[PDB]
């Protein structure tokens, strides 16, 4: 379970501001939480997690793919399996679900067989979609978080983070069909 504070510890010694083996202090590892929350929250709003579909139902509705639920009082259940004519499949890789009550947003994302949670992301909870790589997610974090300090990231590891942002902005992992010769 890769916690949130493992990224901020890896992110800070990535930009060589804390040394190897020592941990961040209290004021350093609590300003990094508000900016690591901001990058995860700006991916469901309008970013590489795909466009969303509006819906307004006040009933026992179950959510579909890529659908932003804005119900007021209801029971919205995120599906685990989907049966498209006995094609009992799991959902696609990196497709999100938003549920919005009166004032509380709860985003969701399905990355490698598990629904990550990605809201109210505290210092103990696991980071969403960091199982794909750990040292790539700490370079996209520390790319702009290091600017409040003096330092900046070197170019051999800056372009590592721009690969991770493009590896989830394309969803090119799942195999698709060949050209057709029609």
């Amino acid at each position: 379970m890769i916690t949130c504070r493992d990224i901020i510890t890896l992110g800070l010694q990535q930009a060589r501001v804390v040394p190897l083996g020592r941990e961040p202090k209290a004021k350093e590892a609590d300003a990094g939480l508000t900016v690591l929350q901001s990058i995860y929250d700006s991916m469901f709003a309008d970013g590489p997690l795909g466009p969303f579909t509006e819906v307004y139902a006040t009933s026992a509705y179950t959510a579909q793919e890529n659908e932003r639920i804005v119900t007021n009082g209801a029971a919205i259940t995120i599906p685990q399996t989907i049966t498209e004519g006995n094609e009992t499949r799991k959902p696609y890789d990196l497709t999100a679900i938003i549920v919005i009550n009166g004032a509380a947003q709860e985003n969701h994302v399905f990355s490698l067989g598990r629904w990550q949670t990605a809201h109210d992301l505290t210092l103990n909870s696991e980071a969403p979609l960091a199982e794909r790589d750990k040292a790539g997610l700490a370079a996209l974090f520390a790319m702009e978080f290091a600017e409040m300090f003096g330092a900046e990231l070197p170019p051999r590891t800056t372009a590592r983070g721009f690969r991770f942002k493009g590896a989830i902005s394309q969803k090119l992992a799942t195999k698709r069909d060949d050209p057709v010769y029609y």
């Binding site: 060949d178 050209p179 057709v180 010769y181």
Partner: protein, 50 residues
């Protein structure tokens, strides 16, 4: 060709060259006939073509 997912097209341009060449022979057909070589009692023996 099936491993490239390609159709296997052919342009059968060798049936055209035979179908119109049999049709020349087939139209100009013939019934047989015997020709008496000298008309001194040889046309009377041309019952053979009948």
């Amino acid at each position: 060709l099936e491993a490239r997912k390609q159709p296997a097209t052919y342009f059968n341009e060798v049936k055209l060259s035979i179908r119109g060449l049999v049709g020349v022979f087939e139209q100009g057909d013939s019934d047989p006939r015997a020709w008496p070589r000298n008309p001194q009692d040889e046309d009377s023996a041309d019952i053979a073509t009948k």
